[PDB]
Design a protein around this ligand. Sequence first.
Ligand SMILES: N=C(N)c1cc(-c2ccccc2)c(-c2cncn2CCN)s1
Ligand SMILES: N=C(N)c1cc(-c2ccccc2)c(-c2cncn2CCN)s1
Ligand SMILES: [Ca+2]
Ligand SMILES: [Ca+2]
Ligand SMILES: [Ca+2]
Ligand SMILES: [Ca+2]
Ligand SMILES: [Cl-]
Ligand SMILES: [Cl-]
Ligand SMILES: [Mg+2]
Ligand SMILES: [Mg+2]
Lengths: 233, 233, 8, 8
Amino acid sequence: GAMGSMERASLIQKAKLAEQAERYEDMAAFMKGAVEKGEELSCEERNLLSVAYKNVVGGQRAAWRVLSSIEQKSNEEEKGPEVREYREKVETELQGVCDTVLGLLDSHLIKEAGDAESRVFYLKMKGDYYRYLAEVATGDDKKRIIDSARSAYQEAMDISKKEMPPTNPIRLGLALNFSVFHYEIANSPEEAISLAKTTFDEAMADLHTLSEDSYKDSTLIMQLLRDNLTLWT
Amino acid sequence: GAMGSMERASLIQKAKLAEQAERYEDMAAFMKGAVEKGEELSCEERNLLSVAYKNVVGGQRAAWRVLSSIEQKSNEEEKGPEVREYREKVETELQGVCDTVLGLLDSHLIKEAGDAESRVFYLKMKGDYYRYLAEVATGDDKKRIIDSARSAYQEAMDISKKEMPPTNPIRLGLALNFSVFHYEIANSPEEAISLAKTTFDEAMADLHTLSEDSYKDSTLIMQLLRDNLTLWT
Amino acid sequence: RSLSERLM
Amino acid sequence: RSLSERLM
Ligand SMILES: N=C(N)c1cc(-c2ccccc2)c(-c2cncn2CCN)s1
Ligand SMILES: N=C(N)c1cc(-c2ccccc2)c(-c2cncn2CCN)s1
Ligand SMILES: [Ca+2]
Ligand SMILES: [Ca+2]
Ligand SMILES: [Ca+2]
Ligand SMILES: [Ca+2]
Ligand SMILES: [Cl-]
Ligand SMILES: [Cl-]
Ligand SMILES: [Mg+2]
Ligand SMILES: [Mg+2]
């Protein structure tokens, strides 16, 4: 990799600078280089990795949705192959980013992650990037991509329920994203609603155990569960 | 170029799609490909070219300013070469974009531009991209870069005053940007203020000649002149 | 569209 | 910073 000659600590430092400068493609390249050094990642480093790729793929997803909408309207005056071609170009670049993230998780972040906070984080990430692949999938692969997302989310859920309190922000973010998977991807709106409700209620009952700062962290994510429940019901 | 196999009309169509999808790097690559077909550009096409590169370089300038500020603070705990290295990386990519735009103008957009609306537009662009180079220049080249910006703006001004009414939006945008050059680059705040004032006053006196739609176009740019005068005085 | 987890 | 020309 082009980052192979840079020190691990310098890559992490530059990822933090790239975040401040809103240079998320650079941030992702620096964090990919850091992962490829072969050492495990601290909590802060895992979050730098997630921030970088979430911003990159988020821009791609937003662009894909704009182009997909234009393409669908055109298929209800014939304008030639250009809309399809350009939607495909963006789609292929999005798939490539998802494949890069999944490859880092498989080589070798997940297999070395033994603590709940790291293992759940990475398995959630695996579910998320298969979910982004599912959003654009149509061929003989959508079903297998959906099942890969489901399997990663389910393993993360099983660990999170055994090893983390119901207010833990990683556990809450996982449940939130799995509920979105159910509603948007898996055609299971009832499962989505049930998961969001149970997650919210069990977190509410555990807030009394938390410090002022942890209370703020957990309630911020609980509000997203509530907002989705308002949209879905 | 990688766009050499794509039709000119398809490149223009995809540039418009990229604009809608906020994919400005793609937009700039498509418009560079269109320029390299060798034909002159219509008014709409010139604006697509400008929108694309202004958004690309604007992001670079914003990132450079964040990094430059961090670097200056560090030079008032020693953190190693990383801040300087990463600021230099962004700077070099910004310079490369400016050089690409200037190369398109020199090969061969300016020399084939005979009408005032095209020639003034391109000469203004040349002033703008030398201005962006001047913002990051420090070595034995800042003076020559500044003089190149000044020369392009001055030629555009001379043509605009002879050939366009004082309310023309291209003429107004040129005067606005030349006033910013004077204030921010050339250390000539009095020249900046004088130019903005005379430009605003001469446009005000010509508004009576305009349709409702042209009045809206011209007054929108006049408001930027006024806002700068408020900031500068 | 449903809201997913935000960056921290 | 001074305001420069906006896109149309
Ligand atoms: N650079 C970023 N985007 C982030 C850095 C960290 C972080 C994590 C641990 C230690 C130091 C910093 C993040 C984090 C994620 N969960 C909580 N935190 C803390 C901040 N609330 S997020
Ligand atoms: N695609 C874009 N960003 C733009 C397209 C055009 C444009 C220009 C001529 C004909 C058709 C469209 C722009 C323009 C720049 N001066 C005025 N106009 C019109 C719009 N007010 S801007
Ligand atoms: Ca381990
Ligand atoms: Ca535990
Ligand atoms: Ca000509
Ligand atoms: Ca004229
Ligand atoms: Cl394409
Ligand atoms: Cl660097
Ligand atoms: Mg080392
Ligand atoms: Mg042709």
